Amino acid sequence: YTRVVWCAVGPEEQKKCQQWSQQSGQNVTCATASTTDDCIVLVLKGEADALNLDGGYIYTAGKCGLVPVLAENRKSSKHSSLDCVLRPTEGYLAVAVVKKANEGLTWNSLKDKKSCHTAVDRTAGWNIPMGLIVNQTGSCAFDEFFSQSCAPGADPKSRLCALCAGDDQGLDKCVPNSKEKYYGYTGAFRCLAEDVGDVAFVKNDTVWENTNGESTADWAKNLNREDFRLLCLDGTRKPVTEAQSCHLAVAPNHAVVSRSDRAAHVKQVLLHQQALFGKNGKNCPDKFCLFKSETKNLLFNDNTECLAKLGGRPTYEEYLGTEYVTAIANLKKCSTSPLLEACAFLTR
């Protein structure tokens, strides 16, 4: 057991995994399934060793006995002195992004509006918002709070899989991988911009990245900041600029996970794989780059500087937080999750 078996979600992520694998020298190899939940099943079964996961999926991974290995990190505003791999992890800002166009659409007016979702179970997309809606209404009927929505991974027939478009042909509509046109940070934000939904549930960084021609993608070229406002909890409406005083909650950074045994191994292999193929990687852009996927945030986020280390070797709880673990657990009192049911039965 020297090779590291990486699970890729969907085919777009599989192509990038191939390259990584060829170029690594079989040092890192590929497994693939259609969803993140599926891939977390591969790691359990041991048809794979590791993948990078949104907090959301980490809770799940975490309940199923998997542990975090490295956390993504990105451009800070402090000590350039400290090495990226030792630079402390910041944690991203989950926001509800609307258009200034949409008059009188505050947080409290979201009732029966249209919504764009990264995916079900994800932090910014789903846990932070649906957490705060579900609690406030003291109702588990989140499935009925928005008139219509795009949350891939939700029931394809249901009204959360209304606005979801699919791929090139409109096949495999509302599947939680990149094949879905409105999937992920980017796909949800395209959704708000193309005016399919009144609000998007993505992160601060997503907005900037896809506004003011900071994006080669056709749909994001023209877009400008002032045509997008942030809903604050208290009820106010503020510009994307003021995300510090107008954000729903603080997200823990997309970590990598594995089984316990394979953690230390996976740690070493990755620290070396990123030294080779990272942003400041000898063989980047010489042969292949791991943190570049064509604004498709494949395997890792594109805004990822490196993968920093985890102080005190922490539990899924310790990493995510006691606050956000409480939030998820409550929201999850409202749903049945087969994966999370099975793991409970077979990690008692």
Ligand X SMILES: *[C@@H]1O[C@H](CO)[C@@H](O)[C@H](O)[C@H]1NC(C)=O
Ligand Y SMILES: *[C@@H]1O[C@H](CO)[C@@H](O[C@@H]2O[C@H](CO)[C@@H](O)[C@H](O)[C@H]2NC(C)=O)[C@H](O)[C@H]1NC(C)=O
Ligand Z SMILES: *[C@@H]1O[C@H](CO)[C@@H](O[C@@H]2O[C@H](CO)[C@@H](O[C@@H]3O[C@H](CO)[C@@H](O[C@H]4O[C@H](CO)[C@@H](O)[C@H](O)[C@@H]4O)[C@H](O)[C@@H]3O)[C@H](O)[C@H]2NC(C)=O)[C@H](O)[C@H]1NC(C)=O
Ligand U SMILES: *[C@@H]1O[C@H](CO)[C@@H](O[C@@H]2O[C@H](CO)[C@@H](O[C@@H]3O[C@H](CO)[C@@H](O)[C@H](O)[C@@H]3O)[C@H](O)[C@H]2NC(C)=O)[C@H](O)[C@H]1NC(C)=O
Interacting residues toward ligand Y by CB under 6 A: 2-3, 22, 24-25, 27, 135-136, 269, 326-327, 330
Q: Is 182 annotated in some ligand binding site?
A: no
- Please report how close the Cβ of residue 249 comes to ligand X at its closest, in angstroms: 7
Best CA proximity match to 13, nearest among 302, 270, 282, 266: 302
Return the H-helix or E-strand segment holding 209.
helix 204-209
Cβ(281)–Cβ(290) below 8 Å: yes
Interface with ligand U in residues 1-40 (CB under 6 A): 24-25, 27
The residue length of the chain stands at 348
Q: What is the DSSP letter of 194?
A: T
Q: Which residue is nearest to ligand X (CB)?
A: 131
- Please report how close the Cβ of residue 207 comes to ligand Z at its closest, in angstroms: 7
Q: Is 330 in the site for ligand X (CB under 6 A)?
A: yes
Q: Which residue is nearest to ligand U (CB)?
A: 27
Tokens 């990272």 label which residue?
278
> Which region holds residue 43: left if phi is over 0, alpha if psi is between -120 and 50, else beta?
alpha
- Please report how close the Cβ of residue 269 comes to ligand U at its closest, in angstroms: 7
Binding span for ligand Z by CB under 6 A among 2-10, 138-146, 207-215, 325-333: 207-215
- Please report how close the Cβ of residue 277 comes to ligand U at its closest, in angstroms: 8
**Which residue lies nearer to ligand U by CB, 132 or 246?**
132
Q: Is 75 in the site for ligand Z (CB under 6 A)?
A: yes
Compute how many other C-beta atoms are within 10 angstroms of the C-beta atom of residue 242. 13
Q: Is 262 annotated in some ligand binding site?
A: no
Q: Is 241 in the site for ligand X (CB under 6 A)?
A: no
Q: How far apart are alpha carbons 217 and 120 in whole angstroms?
A: 25
**Strand, helix or coil for residue 186:** helix
Compute how many other C-beta atoms are within 10 angstroms of the C-beta atom of residue 74. 19
Count of residues touching ligand X (by CB under 6 A): 7
**Contact letters for ligand Z, residues 209-248 (x by CB under 6 A):** x----x----------------------------xx----
Distances in whole angstroms, Cα of residue 288 to Cα of each of 6, 216, 291? 16, 20, 10
Interface with ligand X in residues 99-158 (CB under 6 A): 128, 131-132, 135
Q: Is 32 annotated in some ligand binding site?
A: no
Q: Is 208 in the site for ligand Z (CB under 6 A)?
A: yes
**Cis, bond preceding 285 (omega within 30 deg of 0):** yes
22 binds, among ligand X, ligand Y, ligand U, none (CB under 5 to 8 A by kind): ligand Y
Best CA proximity match to 328, nearest among 55, 38, 36, 111: 55
**Strand, helix or coil for residue 308:** strand
Half-sphere exposure at residue 337, Cβ-oriented, CA atoms within 13 angstroms: 23
Residue list for the binding site:
54, 92, 118, 122, 124-125, 185, 254
**Binding positions for hydrogencarbonate:** 118, 122, 124-125
Site residues, ligand X (CB under 6 A): 128, 131-132, 135, 326-327, 330
Residues contributing to the annotated binding site for Fe(3+): 54, 92, 185, 254
